[PDB]
Design a protein around this ligand. Structure first.
Ligand SMILES: [Cl-]
Ligand SMILES: [Cl-]
Ligand SMILES: [Cl-]
Lengths: 276, 276
């Protein structure tokens, strides 16, 4: 595998066709592997990027302490069979003079994560748009854990006309159900034991739905599950339309249960299709 | 020449390489063909687009009044040699649910035309971004008359990494000096006689520069010229940096004289390299 740190080397090592792309912020885990694994079975050439994007972090968030270990990410991607790793510094990604932004407007970015993290999705859209133009991939892979982000990217691609197939990959979880995330490293041993509550709440709602319960009944079950862990301060818990993310009054195929909140040392999010 | 009005047709008729692109809003004049000509010679396949972009029209502007004559444009590009014409409707370019925007921020879009027409450059960046993504050109041609717009597109291209060479083409002028513009049709025979004041002002400034005068002396000369035609309500007149459009404290190669204002029936803009 070849690792490049500049746009010049990137464009020079890139094939005109057959490129599968996996954008990441580094400190890779099994979940990222699931993405690489999928890109490889569908594309003759796989490119992965590791770049902690400052544009998608808020002032009081974790940009400075975000986990970083390029060597670990390299060996790892190397073993996974990645053809090309793009690991640029902030200056190569955003040179002096950089002044452009891309953003998806409307309820899609205003709801849920958008209300908690103002400016976050504009940062995601901007960096993904740049990465797409630099990589010119045929297919790009994203995890479903960041469901809203997946929808935002799809909207941007649809609107602007990026000839990119945006593929969502199901979330990889620990045995206790905790969705894998680079930020899980922030969890203390004690908090790590309580962290499975998000997925537990989501499963509780899916259970109710499967048993013929109402959306309202499913929501109550989810809320109850979360209350077993007071240390988890919920930002939101809802069952929404799979495409618009608007709260549902009645079930629809693809109904998505979403939840987010924080422990003292980390904020976690998770989601699951709760119907059918 | 093949004419397409949908995205599907467009993608199906486009070759993968050697595409020269000329974006316009219709009602073509000598100047546009100066662009189509340039492209026809440097690229094996030429595509031109005709679309009045509602996004770059703001409050109290001439959207519905903008001149439209598709058939005249067609036959025009036909004889010019263009291989493909993309003339989509508003709904094809911006289908229901469209919510993405692209914008270049900072002084480049806040000064001059940006101050006069707020929201204008976001509309331009957005439509150009989409067109570039839909056409996937190797080169795109723009007229220098809209110099600021030219720099904005170059900035967006450089920032986001579009693999497109943006070509600026010198303005085509009338015998009296009036830069050609599809909006000149708005001028009455009377005000048309006064219109040459813009170029006159620019020339006055270039003359001072050539004589060794200071940047301030050049502006004075330009102010004098406009002062003679009070009918022209000046928006701005300045000598700026060729790349940043910031007012100049002193001369630099490529110094650009820019002017804009409005007669009762229309708004006019023009620019010219005043130094060296
Ligand atoms: Cl983030
Ligand atoms: Cl992650
Ligand atoms: Cl306009």
């Amino acid at each position: 595998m070849r690792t490049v740190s500049t746009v010049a080397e990137l464009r020079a090592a890139l094939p005109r066709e057959g490129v599968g792309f996996v954008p990441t912020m580094g400190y890779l885990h099994r979940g990222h592997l699931a993405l690489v694994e999928r890109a490889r079975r569908e594309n003759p050439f796989v490119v992965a990027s590791v770049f902690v994007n400052p544009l998608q972090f808020g002032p009081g968030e974790d940009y400075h302490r975000y986990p970083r270990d390029l060597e670990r990410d390299r060996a790892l991607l190397q073993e996974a069979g990645v053809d090309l790793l793009f690991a640029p510094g902030v200056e190569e990604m955003y040179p002096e003079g950089f002044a452009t932004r891309v953003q998806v407007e409307g309820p899609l970015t205003a709801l849920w994560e958008g209300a908690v993290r103002p400016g976050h999705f504009q940062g995601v859209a901007t960096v993904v748009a740049r990465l797409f133009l630099l990589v010119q991939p045929q297919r790009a892979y994203f995890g479903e854990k960041d469901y809203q982000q997946l929808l935002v990217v799809r909207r941007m691609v649809r609107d602007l006309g990026f000839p990119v197939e945006v593929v969502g990959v199901p979330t990889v979880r620990e045995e206790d159900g905790l969705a894998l995330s680079s930020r899980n490293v922030y969890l203390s041993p004690e908090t790590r034991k309580k962290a499975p509550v998000l997925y537990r709440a989501l499963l509780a709602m899916r259970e109710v739905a499967g048993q013929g319960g109402s959306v309202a009944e499913a929501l109550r079950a989810g809320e109850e599950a979360l209350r077993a862990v007071p240390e988890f301060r919920k930002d939101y818990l809802a069952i929404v339309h799979p495409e618009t993310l608007l709260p549902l009054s009645d079930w629809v195929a693809g109904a998505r249960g979403i939840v987010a909140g924080r422990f003292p040392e980390a904020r976690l999010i998770d989601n699951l299709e709760v119907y059918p």
